[PDB]
Design a protein around this nucleic acid. Structure first.
Ligand SMILES: [K+]
Ligand SMILES: [K+]
Ligand SMILES: [K+]
Ligand SMILES: [K+]
Ligand SMILES: [K+]
Ligand SMILES: [Mg+2]
Ligand SMILES: [Mg+2]
Ligand SMILES: [Mg+2]
Ligand SMILES: [Mg+2]
Ligand SMILES: [Mg+2]
Ligand SMILES: [Mg+2]
Ligand SMILES: [Mg+2]
Ligand SMILES: [Mg+2]
Ligand SMILES: [Mg+2]
Ligand SMILES: [Mg+2]
Ligand SMILES: [Mg+2]
Ligand SMILES: [Mg+2]
Ligand SMILES: [Mg+2]
Ligand SMILES: [Mg+2]
Ligand SMILES: [Mg+2]
Ligand SMILES: [Mg+2]
Ligand SMILES: [Mg+2]
Ligand SMILES: [Mg+2]
Ligand SMILES: [Mg+2]
Ligand SMILES: [Mg+2]
Ligand SMILES: [Mg+2]
Ligand SMILES: [Mg+2]
Ligand SMILES: [Mg+2]
Ligand SMILES: [Mg+2]
Ligand SMILES: [Mg+2]
Ligand SMILES: [Mg+2]
Ligand SMILES: [Mg+2]
Ligand SMILES: [Mg+2]
Ligand SMILES: [Mg+2]
Ligand SMILES: [Mg+2]
Ligand SMILES: [Mg+2]
Ligand SMILES: [Mg+2]
Ligand SMILES: [Mg+2]
Ligand SMILES: [Mg+2]
Ligand SMILES: [Mg+2]
Ligand SMILES: [Mg+2]
Ligand SMILES: [Mg+2]
Ligand SMILES: [Mg+2]
Ligand SMILES: [Mg+2]
Ligand SMILES: [Mg+2]
Ligand SMILES: [Mg+2]
Ligand SMILES: [Mg+2]
Ligand SMILES: [Mg+2]
Ligand SMILES: [Mg+2]
Ligand SMILES: [Mg+2]
Ligand SMILES: [Mg+2]
Ligand SMILES: [Mg+2]
Ligand SMILES: [Mg+2]
Ligand SMILES: [Mg+2]
Ligand SMILES: [Mg+2]
Ligand SMILES: [Mg+2]
Ligand SMILES: [Mg+2]
Ligand SMILES: [Mg+2]
Ligand SMILES: [Zn+2]
Lengths: 110, 43, 147, 307, 153, 99, 150
RNA sequence: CACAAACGCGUCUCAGAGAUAAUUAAUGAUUUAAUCUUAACCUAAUUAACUCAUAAUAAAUCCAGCCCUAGAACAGGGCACA
RNA sequence: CGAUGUUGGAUCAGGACACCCAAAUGGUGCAACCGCUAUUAAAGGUUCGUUUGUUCAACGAUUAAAGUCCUACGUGAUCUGAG
RNA sequence: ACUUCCAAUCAGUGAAAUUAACCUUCCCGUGAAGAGGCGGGAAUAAAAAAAUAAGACGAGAAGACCCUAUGGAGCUUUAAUU
RNA sequence: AACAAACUCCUAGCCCAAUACCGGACUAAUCUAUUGAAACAUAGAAGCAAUAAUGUUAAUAUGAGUAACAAGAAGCCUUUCUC
């Protein structure tokens, strides 16, 4: 089928600006208590998670150098230790990951 | 529902439009005037 | 409807003009007792279509008045007003009541009552004995006839 | 002021979330158990049964289906309808609802306070009952009025009575014309091109329009329907379960409006029934665990012998 | 009409649905924390919960070994499941994994992301949504009710 | 084009409007428009419909006198017809010719 | 058309002509040329009629400014502040006299559509019609179906 | 029928009052008989439509998120004890 | 004629009454049964197959009945192309 | 009944036939003989998204049928000239 | 009776409709001959005027943000898996 007549701009403006087609505002925006940036209530903070993801990549990068083979995986638990720390009695019997940087504040030792 | 075939004023079948009481009076008024017209021309 | 149509439009005000919103309310009571002239109670029919196929309904004047008491008067006025968009506006000012049961709010707004357009004839039992004796006896029936 | 959206659990601490749930839960049990004396809390006067009177229905929950056999060997299917929480909410006078019969309001099963409107919660606070899920309006004559807040049980219906069922049917979404109305389809293999389930011609050439009553694809299923002439076979007392013959509209675990049948044959069949409703307190006697119709083969009955 | 259907159509069909979750589950076991599309992560949660249940059965049970053989496509993870993941989870019954909604991926598709991980993993903790402290004004008012209620009852 | 045709109709429409106002103000006194005009001309009062409409709105008292004049003239016309036709012309029906 | 242009009511500036008549024209300024052939009509008007025109109308001030120009113009200003530009380019002597005389008789108001050909203040002599000006009064002012208090 | 559902070949339910056309009968006048009456009053037997009784619908203004036998989107029902 | 696409079927049917069935009734060369004929009524219904491209028609089986006709002899921006 | 490609929502890029102006209803009647626009009446807060194809004598090709043109061409011969 | 025209009176005038063909009076914008010198006058000359040719070129819309198009997954980021 083909159109019969050209749509007037008066009709087009009504259709192109209808309240349904407009962008709805968001009322669930909140400031992250830890870093002060913006996040939604039901979504993890983008800045805080990116902080964790960068650290997680470094830890995993260290593990890869400790297992050269592509099919080498530990048969025991894993513990991550930073500079200025030594393994505890409960942490013995597990593989040790060493990082030169100081232990981050958000990461909590058990 | 009921249509007048073809055009409504020409042909074998036309509109049944009747003569009104006003139309009869108009004819009489002209007739009375013309009756006087042919008297002044008589002599 | 003829006198009611004039009042609704405002055709009785010498300041009348279609653009102006001049208009007067009309209250019609005792609409169940209207008297159709001739045999129009059984001959005149009011027809409407609901839109759906097979939805053409024709109702006799007697049947319509038996169901909706004020439908006969309302339709008569609704067809006599001018066919512009003001007809809907000026119909809202028309108040119809089947009998003499009018709320006190409407009663306090009235000003004057319009005269009845048709003189109601009186029945035989409504004639006073003075009128009966005044009218002459046209003929003298024989004494031996049995009525 | 662009105030942010909030919910009940937003600002509650971990040490108070269990406390709030306990607080509301204890209130519901106290309120429900305080209404269990309809005849001891100054009820409205009760009038004797009269011809042409109508009783009050219930709001029940549809559990499922069971097979049932009669003493003549025939097999019937019954639907288990359970009355969980039924209470009359408000009473409307005769001249303010219809002008012919009064209206009695009946609520549904108990729901959480935290997901209802402010007006709805405020309305129930004055009455002193937990919020209900579904609310329906019943047409009741003036001689069968019930004081609001009076509980109702499945014993309101005695076996042998015919009842109606009104509920929203199963919604099947936007279904084509073949499923919705049942139009036959075009053939499948004899050369047909891109036409197997389409309605086909929808009007005539002359009218140059589509009639308002024309059948077209659209929504199917999610509408209110009523079933008439359903017989009551068995009534369970302690669980408040009603058995109705046949299939009732609505999916499982839905709320069903139950009332006395309005069919002409089943008129005035309430003289031998509780009026205006079954009051357990007034009788001062224990009803049987299950009420059976006279034609029902009970599970603890000897096997059928056609001797 | 999809009434009662608890599964989702993913990939190229019912067979590709399992394989897509097979690769995700393998990545989840080896790394203990992966991120993917929210719809795919939601499906993966169901299998990860029950995979630990098969791990608790033991290294000697034949069905558990065969079930773990198919899902763990990398053969160096089977000893890990029966000797690390299974021994770690002995207390809880169903609290094996967490799912949180990561913000939308910074790409064209703008998909809805999610993060799935196992309890007690050897990684920095995620920024979990912490509830309000009991010292808040609303909590203090409610704690007054509890103290008064416990004093009388 | 519509401007010129409406200009021709402007005179007709205003003339129609005036007659409605004259009829409205005449019915208020119980006299129809046809009786109000012919019985006023018989009094040799040459007032066009434009000024009669203005007298109807802004001169309620004067318009009553003209309505009173028309009704009195009309009642005299019927009296002559009811009689033998030899009655002298009424006190208001006498024709005055200027010459 | 009427819907396109503005409109005004028939108004006389400063209630002119009620107590006394004041010629609303204030001044004129002629901008003609001494060499352009198109200014011949203006030059003939100045030599002959300008001197006589000033005597008849002592309330107007006439300015003549012969300067090099191609289109002769005459500018008329009125008391109310309206300035009307006119062109006398290539016109006869008698045409200039008619044009100037026409400018002397105008009140100065804008020349647009006049809604009504009349204007009046307080036209409601002996009263104006209201729906109660012809309805008889009922004893006690009772409504049509009103019950008496006693 | 390799989904917790859908589906038929399977199961369930399906109604009272008014009102009429042709026609039939009573009482009875113009025409003191008779005669169903575009004669009056009252009244009777009587097609289908149609109209209605009746039944369905019913609470203005929690709604971010998750679930759903609700759903194209948008809406709708649940999220206290589960 | 700077295009109103053309037979039959498939799908969906809207309408008229000069009614095939279903309801009421008058007449009969109407005892009953089966019929013939006339008045009133259009809400619903009006089958499945062999041959032919067929509408039509013939034939087999059945039904309360397998009505007449209009709708661009409805309906190809829904299908079919045997003619 | 169930799957995949389409489909509908979100993000990116983004075309075509078509279009006198349109603030673009229904019915009967009229009419260059089939009306959204005329006449007599009816209906009528404004917009968005998703569907079905009766009408806009829908879009597409200056009708292939038919006739006309002292307009062409191919083929055949007992047409005319050669 | 009344209401009712391009008719006819009334007040002023510049004082009576139209398709093909024919007649007349004026005139927008260019160049040249003399004037003119905040843009004109009398003349002589012409590529002397576009709401309409499925017109030409260029630019814009409408149809429409519609039809339709693409990158297997995870991670330690380029290594292991699914086909
Ligand atoms: K004809
Ligand atoms: K007779
Ligand atoms: K043609
Ligand atoms: K039929
Ligand atoms: K269409
Ligand atoms: Mg015709
Ligand atoms: Mg004729
Ligand atoms: Mg559904
Ligand atoms: Mg089929
Ligand atoms: Mg094809
Ligand atoms: Mg196919
Ligand atoms: Mg039509
Ligand atoms: Mg829908
Ligand atoms: Mg689902
Ligand atoms: Mg896909
Ligand atoms: Mg899920
Ligand atoms: Mg007799
Ligand atoms: Mg009803
Ligand atoms: Mg909700
Ligand atoms: Mg065309
Ligand atoms: Mg057909
Ligand atoms: Mg049909
Ligand atoms: Mg018939
Ligand atoms: Mg029959
Ligand atoms: Mg056809
Ligand atoms: Mg066809
Ligand atoms: Mg096609
Ligand atoms: Mg078609
Ligand atoms: Mg063929
Ligand atoms: Mg898009
Ligand atoms: Mg519109
Ligand atoms: Mg027509
Ligand atoms: Mg019209
Ligand atoms: Mg009209
Ligand atoms: Mg779309
Ligand atoms: Mg669409
Ligand atoms: Mg058109
Ligand atoms: Mg067509
Ligand atoms: Mg076309
Ligand atoms: Mg052609
Ligand atoms: Mg040919
Ligand atoms: Mg020729
Ligand atoms: Mg030739
Ligand atoms: Mg040639
Ligand atoms: Mg050749
Ligand atoms: Mg030869
Ligand atoms: Mg006239
Ligand atoms: Mg001429
Ligand atoms: Mg011609
Ligand atoms: Mg020149
Ligand atoms: Mg040219
Ligand atoms: Mg141009
Ligand atoms: Mg074209
Ligand atoms: Mg062009
Ligand atoms: Mg350009
Ligand atoms: Mg665009
Ligand atoms: Mg579109
Ligand atoms: Mg697409
Ligand atoms: Zn943060």
């Amino acid at each position: 089928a083909a159109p019969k007549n050209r749509r007037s701009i008066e009709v087009n403006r009504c259709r192109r600006r209808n309240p349904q087609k407009l962008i709805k505002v968001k009322n669930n925006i909140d400031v992250c208590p830890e870093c002060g940036h913006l996040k939604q209530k039901h979504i993890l903070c983008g800045y805080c998670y990116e902080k964790v993801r960068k650290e997680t990549a470094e830890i995993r990068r260290q593990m890869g150098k400790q297992e050269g083979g592509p099919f080498r995986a530990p048969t025991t638990e894993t513990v991550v230790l930073y500079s200025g720390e030594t393994p505890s009695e409960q942490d013995q019997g597990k593989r040790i990951i060493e990082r030169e940087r100081k232990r981050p504040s958000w990461f909590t030792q058990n | 529902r009921n249509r007048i075939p073809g055009r409504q004023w020409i042909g074998k079948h036309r509109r049944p439009r009747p003569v009104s009481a006003q139309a009869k009076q108009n004819m009489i008024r002209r007739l009375e005037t013309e009756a006087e017209n042919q008297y002044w021309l008589s002599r | 409807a003829a006198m009611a149509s004039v009042k609704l439009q405002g055709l009785h005000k010498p300041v009348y003009h279609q653009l102006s919103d001049c208009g007067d309310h009309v209250v019609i009571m005792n609409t169940r007792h209207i008297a159709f002239s001739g045999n129009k109670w059984e001959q005149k029919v009011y027809s409407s279509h609901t839109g759906y196929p097979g939805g053409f309904r024709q109702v006799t004047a007697a049947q319509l008045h038996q169901k909706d008491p004020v439908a006969i008067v309302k339709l008569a006025i609704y067809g006599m007003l001018p066919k512009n968009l003001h007809r809907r506006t000026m119909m809202q000012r028309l108040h119809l009541f089947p009998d003499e049961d009018i709320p006190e709010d409407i009663l306090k707004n009235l000003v004057e009552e319009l005269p009845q357009p048709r003189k109601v004839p009186r029945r035989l039992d409504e004639y006073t004995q003075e009128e009966i004796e005044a009218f002459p006896r046209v003929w003298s029936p024989p004494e031996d006839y049995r009525l | 002021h662009g105030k942010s959206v909030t919910w009940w659990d937003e600002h509650l601490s971990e040490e108070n979330v269990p406390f709030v749930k306990q607080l509301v839960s204890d209130e519901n049990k106290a309120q429900l158990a305080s209404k269990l004396c309809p005849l001891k809390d100054e009820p409205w006067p009760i009038h004797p049964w009269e011809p042409g009177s109508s009783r009050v229905g219930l709001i029940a929950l549809k559990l499922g289906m069971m097979p049932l056999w009669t003493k003549d060997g025939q097999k019937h299917v019954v639907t288990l309808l359970q009355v969980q929480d039924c209470h009359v909410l408000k009473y409307t006078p005769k001249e303010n609802h219809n002008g012919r019969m009064a209206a009695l309001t009946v609520g549904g099963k108990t729901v959480s306070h935290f997901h209802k409107s402010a007006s709805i919660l405020e309305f129930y606070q004055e009455l002193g009952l937990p919020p209900k899920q579904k609310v329906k309006i019943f047409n009741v004559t003036e001689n069968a009025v019930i004081k609001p807040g009076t509980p109702l049980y499945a014993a309101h219906f005695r076996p042998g009575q015919y009842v109606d069922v009104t509920a929203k049917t199963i919604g099947k979404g936007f279904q084509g014309v073949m499923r919705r109305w049942g139009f036959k389809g075009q053939p499948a293999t004899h050369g047909q091109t891109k036409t197997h389930r389409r309605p086909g011609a929808i009007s005539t050439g002359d009218v140059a329009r589509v009639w308002p009553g024309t059948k077209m694809p659209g929504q199917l299923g999610n509408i209110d329907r009523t079933a008439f002439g359903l017989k009551v076979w068995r009534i369970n007392t302690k669980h408040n379960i009603i058995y109705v013959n046949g299939s009732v509209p609505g999916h499982k675990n839905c709320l069903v409006k139950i009332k006395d049948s309005k069919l002409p044959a089943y008129k005035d069949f309430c003289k031998n029934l509780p009026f205006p409703t079954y009051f357990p307190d007034g009788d001062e006697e224990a009803l049987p665990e299950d009420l059976y119709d006279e034609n029902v083969c009970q599970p603890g009955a000897p096997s059928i012998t056609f001797t | 009409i999809s009434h009662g259907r608890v599964f989702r159509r993913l990939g190229l069909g019912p067979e590709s649905r399992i394989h897509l979750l097979q690769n995700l589950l393998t990545g989840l076991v080896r790394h203990e924390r992966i991120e993917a599309s929210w719809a795919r992560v939601d499906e993966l949660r169901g299998y990860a919960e029950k995979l630990i249940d098969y791990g608790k059965l033991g290294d000697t049970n034949e069905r558990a070994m065969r079930m773990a053989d198919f899902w763990l496509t990398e053969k160096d993870l089977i000893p890990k499941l029966f000797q690390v993941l299974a021994p770690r989870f002995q207390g809880q019954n169903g609290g094996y994994t967490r799912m949180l909604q990561i913000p939308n991926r910074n790409e064209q598709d703008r998909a809805k992301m999610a993060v799935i991980e196992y309890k007690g993993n050897c990684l920095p903790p995620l920024p979990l949504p912490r509830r309000d402290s009991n010292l808040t004004l609303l909590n203090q008012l409610l704690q007054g009710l509890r103290q008064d209620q416990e004093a009388s009852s | 084009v519509k401007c010129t045709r409406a200009r021709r109709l402007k005179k007709r429409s205003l003339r129609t409007l005036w007659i409605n106002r004259i009829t409205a103000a005449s019915q208020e006194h119980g006299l129809k428009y046809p009786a109000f005009i012919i019985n006023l001309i018989k009094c040799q009062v040459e007032l066009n419909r434009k000024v009669l409409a203005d007298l109807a709105i802004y001169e309620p008292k004067t318009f009553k006198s003209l309505a009173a004049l028309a009704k009195r003239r009309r009642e005299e016309g019927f009296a002559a017809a009811l009689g033998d036709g030899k009655e002298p012309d009424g006190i208001f029906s006498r024709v005055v010719q200027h010459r | 058309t009427a819907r396109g242009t503005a409109s005004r009511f028939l108004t006389s500036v400063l209630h002119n002509g009620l107590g006394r008549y004041v010629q609303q024209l204030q001044r004129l300024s002629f901008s003609l040329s001494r060499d352009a052939p198109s200014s011949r009509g203006a030059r003939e008007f100045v030599e002959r009629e300008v001197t006589d025109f000033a005597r008849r109308n002592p309330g107007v001030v006439i300015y003549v400014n012969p300067r090099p120009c191609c289109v002769p113009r005459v500018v008329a200003e009125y008391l109310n502040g309206a300035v009307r530009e006119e062109s006398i380019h290539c016109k006869s002597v008698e045409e200039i006299a008619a044009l100037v005389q026409k400018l002397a008789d105008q009140s100065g108001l804008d020349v647009i559509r006049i809604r009504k050909p009349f204007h009046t203040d307080s036209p409601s002599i002996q009263g104006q019609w209201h729906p109660f000006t012809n309805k008889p009064t009922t004893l006690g002012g009772l409504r049509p179906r009103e019950v008496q208090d006693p």
